[PDB]
Structure formats: C-alpha cells, structure tokens
Structure 1
Amino acid sequence: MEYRLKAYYREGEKPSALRRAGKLPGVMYNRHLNRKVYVDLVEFDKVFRQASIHHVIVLELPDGQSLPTLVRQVNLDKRRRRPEHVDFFVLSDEPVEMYVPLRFVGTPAGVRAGGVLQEIHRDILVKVSPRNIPEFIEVDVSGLEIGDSLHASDLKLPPGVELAVSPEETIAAVVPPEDVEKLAEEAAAEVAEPEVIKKGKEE
C-alpha cells in the first residue's frame, strides 16, 4: 500500500549522539529542497522492511507538513550490519525513476527437474508517474527449463511505466542444482600450478 512515518528536523546535533538515542539520522531532498532530518530507528525499521525502495512513504513533519517520499539510498554499518543513514527523496508531480518489485508467478519445468530458480533481479528500475506506482509486476517463469532465462525485454508492462534498463538485461534464470554425485568427479580434477605473468625479457 502506502506507509506513514514521523520525521523530525535536525540541526547541529551529532549523528553519533542521535544514533545512541535510538534515532536514525538521514536527509530529505529533491531538486527544490534539502533538509536535515532524523527518524526513529525502531519505527523506521517497521516501515522499511515492507516498504523498501518500492512503496511511497509519507513523512509527517512537526511543522505540520506531510511529504510523500521514496527511500533512494540506505547506508549500512559494514561491521554491525545496521542502518546508519537514510535518504528520503521528496516526490513531486513529475515522473521519477525507481525500483519496482517483480513477482515470478508460476513453477518452472526446470524446477520440476530438480533445478533452481535464481532470481537475478528481484525488482526492476522503471520511469513512471508517482500516481502510477504498481504494487508489483508479474512474470511467467513456468516455461523455464534448465537452463533457460528471461530478460527485461520479456517483461509485459502496466500502463505508463517505462523500462529504465537495457532490454538485454537478464532478470532470472533456472540453473542446475548441487549434487553429491558431482563431488567425486570434482575431487578427481587435478590442478596444474599457477603460471606466472613474467617481468622483463619475459612478460
């Protein structure tokens, strides 16, 4: 659907201090504005885990406003794997590029043969009107064999949405599964030493 999230303005307070208070710092911007903001970590998590960069988020500001935004970029703590910064993109009447979920409807024939569906793109980048945001986009993978694949070209689009990636871009494939029978022959494969790219009168 469409989710709501309370956001507060921030000034000279330290991002370090905010995060320790349980508040996840971020910024709000578009071609017109640019405001330093902070949300609550635990609240934002609740929203974002479903919303993501796919659904619109309305930001209830304390000045009384309510800006409808998309999350454009999230910054993770590479050590702790936690969010440390949020980019809220203030949406306006003009079209905007964004990522739109894909649903792979159907059970591939390769999957019946034991294969595995590798969902390369679990969403797709699309130029579209803000009023025109699809909940998802269906894809028929039922006709996929080991090892066949679909591309963004094979994506049948809803009205008003335009592809922002190369039609050549592969999006999903069905690949052979791990097998213990492969272990014996994989183990029997003897490896020759790494040759050296040389320097000088050899190179």
Structure 2
Amino acid sequence: EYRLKAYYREGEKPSALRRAGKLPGVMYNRHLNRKVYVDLVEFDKVFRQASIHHVIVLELPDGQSLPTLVRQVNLDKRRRRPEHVDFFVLSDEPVEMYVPLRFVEIHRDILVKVSPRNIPEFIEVDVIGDSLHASDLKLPPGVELAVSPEETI
C-alpha cells in the first residue's frame, strides 16, 4: 500500500546525485539488475512507515509499476543519512522477509518466508522475571518460520 517514483541512472556520479537531493540505488532479482535513483525526501517519508516489511511500488518512466521490497539501506555514518538503497523486485516465487511485531524488546522484525499475496501486517503477542520466545508466535496461515525455533523476543 505504498508508491514511490524511481528514475533510471546510467553514469551520473552518485556524489553528484546526492548533492542534488537524490538517492542512488539499485533494483534486482534473479532476472534483472538495473541502476535507479529516487528523490531523497520522497523515499524518507515512505520508508519511515514502509520499512523492510511493507511493499513499495516503484513508478518507472517506462510505464511499469514494479512491486519491490527494501533489502538494504546503507547509511552515512557521520550524517546519519541513507546513501544507498537496495530494492528487491518481487515475483511469483515465495520470498523470505521480515514482518513487523505487535505487542500488547529483543526483536522488532520476525523473519518468515511468505508469498507476496499473503504478507501479514500484524503479529499480536500478549505479555515479573520471564521471557517470550519466537516459538510462541501466532504464525498465521501462509508463512513458514525463517528463524531459529528458540529465539527470544
């Protein structure tokens, strides 16, 4: 439920792009690998609510709306700003990626393989001196655990 505009890049220097308020990046899967860039403020507003969990649809100047997932954000250590973004392009095959957690500490994104059509949004867990393991997750239909069975959350 998110959209963002991406523009192809060929040889413009990434430092030149960043001084213009842009964000260099790449998009790939097992079939394609294309260099892109996005507007920095536009990406930041989406990414704060669409983390590595939610799908971002990229609008290309070629008329293709590709549904992607963020796999990697490379930060500028000094300025605490993103310098590169990796976009994983979704397809018909199942994919492993991190879904959010809903509480009502140890982790904030539990990893499960899932199809793109059954991506869940909420994993509610009910909470002295004890601990909560990942083994106590609800595990809604459509996902398989991609972590160790005894992870503490």
Q: TM-score range by the shorter chain?
A: over 0.9
Q: Distance in 1 between matches of 2:30 and 2:134?
A: 29
Q: Distance in 1 between matches of 2:33 and 2:97?
A: 20
**CA deviation digits over 1:46-67, x for unaligned, max 9?**
1000001010000000011110
Q: Following superposition of structure 1 onto structure 2, how do residues 5-154 of structure 1 map, counting pairs within 5 Å? A: 5-104=4-103, 119-141=105-127, 146-154=128-136
**SS at structure 2 position matched to 1:149:** coil
**Structure 1 runs not aligned, ≥5 long:** 105-118, 171-203
State the shift of 1:123 in Å: 1.6
Q: Distance in 2 between matches of 1:76 and 1:83?
A: 4
Normalising by structure 2, we get a TM-score of 0.97
**CA deviation digits over 1:68-93, x for unaligned, max 9?**
00000000001111000000000001
**Structure 2 runs not aligned, ≥5 long:** none
1:4 corresponds to which residue?
A: 3
- The CA RMSD over aligned residues, in Å, is 0.6
Q: Quick one: percent identity of the two aligned structures? A: 100
Give 1 or 2 for the bigger CA radius of gyration: 1
**SS at structure 2 position matched to 1:7:** strand
Q: Distance in 1 between matches of 2:112 and 2:135?
A: 13
Normalising by structure 1, we get a TM-score of 0.73
Q: Distance in 2 between matches of 1:156 and 1:50?
A: 23
State the shift of 1:140 in Å: 1.1
State the shift of 1:147 in Å: 1.5
